[PDB]
Ligand binder design. Structure first.
Ligand SMILES: O=P(O)(O)O[C@H]1[C@H](OP(=O)(O)O)[C@@H](OP(=O)(O)O)[C@H](OP(=O)(O)O)[C@@H](OP(=O)(O)O)[C@H]1OP(=O)(O)O
Ligand SMILES: Nc1ncnc2c1ncn2[C@@H]1O[C@H](COP(=O)(O)OP(=O)(O)OP(=O)(O)O)[C@@H](O)[C@H]1O
Length: 1011
């Protein structure tokens, strides 16, 4: 099977079929350089059955700056690189059988041994050898998937070749869409109309299936190719021979296999299918490909890479590139700058770019071994020329190696920028999947390793769980239930002994703002967020905007990822970007009229919360507010009203006393949820009732419920009964054993249970989507008397003791599979689904939807971490606006889009006065300084007269209010009454617009000093 506790988050990304295909697959990886190590790490974290790492190079001091598993002892002993890293790699995932190899590769090497590997990845291999290996691999039956990846300084090359014909079983991996049908016309071709404000969002040529269609019963169960006509309509083909449309209908998107044609590596070198990553330079990938091919030819010709600063070598490389360009089909122009920089940084190696390319290549390997997504076709050329482009023309002496571990990075970015990196003060927020990779990149780049000023602060309150080991490679199984930051710091210190780190456990929130005051942010140079929610992102961005400090943001949703770069005085902040809010499920839809499995899952989750967390909390709070039941009864008899008293009384009268009573209560709850509710709803609205227009009320998207008869033999009913009984026993503190969960024991208990007869009641049911949950309806006197009688009976029965007035409150924990929370939610959701004839969902989908688990995989995390590290380098260098690039990537397509970061927008108020979001105004005063003096000072310093003073919720001054015109004479200390904690106070000021009737135009925040 599949270890769900470890692969829970990856299971949603890939699927159990892809997971089973990931086993039984043997992957051969060669080179074990900086890039090969990243690829191997990502693959082992993914969970491939067996990986064979192979290398022949001996470890060197230069390798320490690129390999995060090597140590100085390995260099001393001159061990093989694969042998040295084999022990560490295997510990990442014990399920993976990792083996090392050292068989030499050359012209005469026999390639017969590669037939046992599904996929082959080659790094740091000579080009003719790659050609021969690819030719052998693609000619096998079945073809062996070939992937080649290389990194030379700041330039990278990625290649894929999955045989002549590769069968993709899933083009995108998105959830199939469901489109509700409004009306279908009998025509050749017929036209299908969707419901209003429900765009189908479909593409011409896709195949759809139909069900629950009245009139055209033939269309049910059939598959038709469609042509898009309008956002709410499309054509499916001839429908004249069918019966006229009545009502109803659901169309479901159908996924089909797709065939992708690749080509041999030898032929691809002349007509490359490069993937465009920057639409502003569509022809850049072709030029980069030409330059790298010229570099390979230079290596073949001279047996060495070009020397940095040797003009003759650069001229020779340019000549070779010019010669190569003519042989290309398109004959593109040779980019002198790209060739020159490739010559300059040929011998270097950039760690973040290596990590990004490793993530992409690992995703491609997974595509090769599973067919889950559309593979790359065929070349991907990532580059980081922006890092050195802003440097202009530096001297060669800044790039010469100096013997330390940072020679690889120095040969790329020069000594000056390396020194600037070592003195950074980085405040890294959150230490999740992205945080660990960012720490690894920091250790590789030497960030904060200086003994003078460098310092890294990482803060995180969570604890390590088993499911986190799949993505966060810095953690180990023995680290479970330990702080994330401490473990990450301990591991990073192992990676680079010189690094300075300072872990924290505080959660970044306004409650902890005292620790992370303004001075602390002033000390920091770069702030990086690895958060998973939105509110924390907005809070951190607001703090950074207040303190004028650059912020880097990133996030991953499965194969999707995005990076955002925020720079003071240059780019818009995160708060300036506002997405539409979350999709609120209508209250009427959730409560009474579900239409999809998501609605039932949400209803089950809310029912669980209300039954086991909210209601017990109310019960405990009520019984702690008052002494005992006698006092409450006396108050009620005197006419006193208490909040939620009747509900508490009802709960007390139904408290189970033993396991049998708990089972009976679960049975009654089942009957109420899935038998009485449907009958009540049908009684309120019969199946054949119609509206004023004559249309059936029970039409799409509403679905008519049907009662469910209890049956212990049904596995679903038994599962629900068991889970409900266990949860109720836990809440009411009733001991039980597994024998009590047996079907026979439950049947014996249920033999004596009498089922109360259902009786319909007159209740108002909200049907409009705009309706929401109303407040508490006042309770009639008869219900009050019933509650009084029940409470008196409980008191007289001596069942109101202290033990009876307390009951434990459960917390919804989803990762713990033995508590039965997810089992109960799944049982309730499926049972409700059968009530409304909705398709049931399995346990894992319910766990994902109810728990709001965000799918995530290691490869996307590594890629976004590498890109964020590149942007951090750019920020540290203080480069101009054009250098920074926001990134959005979706490896499922695959697609990578680099775009310029959003330019800061200037907002004008009056007389040409303009301000940015980064601007903050300062005012100084004294004790007798009045509001009129404040207005005069503002109009003097900035030329604009204030007309609106706000401090949060405080209403300070408006000239138009009838009675507050006198406030101009009031001093600040009396107008706002500020706290004495600080010497200044922040205010929000607006000015009257040039056109009357409009609200005063808000201005930049203004900080007023009391002295
Ligand atoms: O408190 P809620 O989570 O909103 O659930 C309540 C509650 O049902 P449970 O106690 O079974 O969870 C009501 O029962 P009381 O505790 O008030 O007796 C029940 O009312 P009825 O038993 O009278 O049907 C009502 O259902 P409704 O609003 O349809 O009357 C139902 O609400 P939901 O199940 O829709 O949440
Ligand atoms: N306000 C905050 N301050 C500090 N750390 C935060 C804050 N909000 C979230 N975090 C951290 O963000 C991290 C997010 O990590 P990640 O995205 O890998 O998921 P996770 O929390 O480990 O779990 P899962 O992926 O299962 O939801 C968590 O470790 C959490 O501690």
């Amino acid at each position: 099977e599949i270890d769900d506790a470890l692969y829970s988050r990856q299971r949603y990304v890939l699927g159990d079929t892809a997971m089973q295909k990931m086993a039984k697959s043997h992957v051969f990886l060669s080179g074990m350089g900086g890039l090969g190590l990243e690829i191997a790490k990502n693959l082992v974290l993914a969970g491939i059955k067996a990986v064979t790492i192979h290398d022949t190079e001996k470890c060197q001091a230069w390798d320490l700056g690129t390999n995060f598993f090597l140590s100085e002892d390995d260099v001393v002993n001159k061990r093989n690189r694969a042998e040295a890293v084999l022990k560490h790699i295997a510990e990442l995932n014990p399920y993976v059988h990792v083996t090392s190899s050292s068989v030499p590769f050359n012209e005469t090497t026999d390639l017969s041994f590669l037939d046992k590997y599904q996929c082959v990845v080659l790094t740091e291999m000579k080009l003719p050898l790659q050609k021969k290996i690819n030719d052998f691999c693609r000619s096998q039956c079945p073809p062996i998937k070939f992937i080649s990846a290389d990194v030379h300084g700041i330039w990278s090359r990625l290649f894929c070749d999955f045989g002549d014909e590769f069968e993709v079983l899933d083009t995108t991996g998105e959830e199939p869409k469901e489109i509700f049908i409004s009306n279908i016309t009998q025509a050749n071709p017929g036209i299908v109309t969707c419901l209003e404000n429900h765009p189908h969002k479909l593409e011409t040529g896709q195949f759809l299936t139909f069900r629950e269609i009245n009139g055209m019963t033939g269309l049910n169960g059939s598959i038709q190719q469609i042509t898009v006509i309008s956002p709410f309509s499309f054509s499916i083909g001839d429908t004249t021979e069918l019966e006229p449309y009545l009502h109803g209908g659901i169309a479901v998107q159908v996924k089909t296999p797709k065939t992708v044609f690749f080509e041999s590596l030898e032929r691809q070198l002349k007509h490359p299918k490069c993937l465009i990553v920057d639409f502003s330079n569509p022809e850049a990938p072709l030029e980069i490909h030409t330059a790298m091919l010229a570099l390979d030819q230079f290596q073949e010709k001279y047996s060495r890479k070009p020397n940095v600063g040797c003009q003759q070598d650069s001229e020779e490389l340019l000549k070779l590139a010019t010669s190569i360009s003519e042989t290309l089909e398109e004959k593109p122009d040779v980019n002198a700058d790209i060739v020159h920089w490739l010559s300059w940084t040929a011998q270097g190696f950039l760690s973040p770019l290596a990590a990004a390319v490793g993530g992409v290549a690992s995703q491609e390997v997974l595509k090769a071994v599973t067919g889950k997504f559309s593979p790359l076709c065929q070349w991907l050329y990532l580059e980081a020329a922006d890092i050195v482009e802003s440097l202009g023309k530096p001297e060669c002496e800044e790039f010469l190696p100096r013997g330390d571990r940072y020679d690889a990075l120095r040969a790329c970015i020069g000594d000056t920028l390396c020194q600037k990196l070592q003195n950074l003060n980085i405040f890294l927020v959150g230490c999740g999947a992205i945080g660990c990779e960012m720490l690894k990149n920091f250790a590789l780049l030497g960030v904060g390793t200086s003994k003078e000023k460098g310092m890294i602060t990482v803060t995180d309150p969570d604890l390590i769980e088993k499911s986190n080991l799949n993505r966060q490679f810095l953690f180990r199984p023995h680290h479970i239930q330990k702080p994330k930051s401490y473990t990450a710091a301990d591991a990073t210190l192992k990676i680079n002994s010189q690094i300075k780190i300072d872990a924290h456990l505080n959660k970044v929130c306004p409650t902890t703002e005292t620790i992370y005051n303004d001075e602390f942010y002033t000390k920091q140079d770069v702030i990086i967020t690895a958060l998973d929610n939105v509110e924390a992102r907005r809070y951190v961005d607001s703090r950074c905007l207040a303190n004028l400090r650059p912020l880097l943001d990133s996030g991953t949703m499965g194969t999707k990822g995005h990076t955002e770069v925020i720079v003071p005085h240059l780019t818009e902040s995160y708060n300036s970007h506002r997405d539409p809010p979350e999709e609120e499920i209508p209250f009427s839809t959730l409560k009474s009229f579900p239409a999809a499995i998501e609605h039932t899952i949400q209803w089950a989750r809310d029912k669980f919360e209300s039954s086991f967390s909210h209601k017990p909390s109310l019960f405990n709070k009520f019984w702690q507010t008052y002494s005992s039941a006698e006092e409450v009864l006396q108050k009620i008899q005197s006419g006193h009203s208490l909040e939620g008293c009747f509900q508490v009384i009802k709960l007390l009268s139904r408290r189970p006393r033993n396991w049998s009573q708990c089972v009976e209560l679960a049975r009654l709850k089942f009957e109420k949820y899935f038998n009485h509710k449907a009958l009540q709803l049908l009684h309120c609205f019969p199946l054949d009732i119609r509206l004023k227009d004559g249309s059936l009320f029970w039409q799409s998207p509403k679905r008519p419920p049907s009662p469910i008869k209890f049956d212990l033999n049904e596995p679903l009913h038994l599962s629900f009964l068991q889970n409900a009984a266990k949860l109720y026993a836990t809440v009411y503190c009733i001991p039980f054993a597994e024998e009590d969960l047996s079907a026979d024991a439950l049947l014996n208990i249920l033999s004596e249970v009498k089922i109360q007869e259902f009786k319909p009641s007159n209740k108002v049911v909200q049907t409009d989507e705009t309706a929401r949950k109303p407040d508490h309806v006042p309770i009639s006197s008869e219900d009050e008397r019933n509650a009084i009688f029940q409470l008196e009976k409980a008191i007289l029965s001596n069942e109101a003791t202290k033990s009876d007035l307390q009951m434990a409150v459960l917390s919804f924990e989803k990762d713990d599979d033995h508590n039965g929370h997810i089992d109960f939610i799944t049982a309730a959701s499926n049972l409700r689904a059968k009530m409304y004839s909705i398709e049931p969902a399995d346990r894992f989908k319910t766990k994902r939807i109810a728990g709001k688990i965000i799918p995530a995989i290691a490869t996307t995390t590594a890629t976004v971490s590498g890109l964020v590290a590149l942007e951090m380098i750019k920020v540290t260098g203080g480069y101009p606006f054009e250098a920074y690039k926001n990134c959005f990537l979706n490896l499922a397509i695959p697609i990578v889009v680099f775009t310029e970061t959003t330019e800061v927008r200037k907002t004008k108020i009056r007389n040409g006065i303009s301000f940015t979001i980064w601007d903050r105004w300062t005012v100084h005063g004294k004790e007798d300084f009045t509001l009129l003096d404040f207005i005069n000072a503002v109009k003097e310093k900035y030329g604009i007269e204030p007309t609106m003073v706000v401090q949060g919720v405080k209403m300070l001054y408006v000239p138009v209010m009838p009675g507050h015109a006198k406030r101009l004479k009031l001093t600040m200390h009396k107008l706002v009454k500020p706290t004495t904690e600080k010497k200044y106070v922040d205010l929000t000021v607006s000015f009257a617009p040039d056109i009357d009737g409009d609200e005063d135009l808000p201005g930049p925040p203004v900080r007023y000093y009391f002295s």
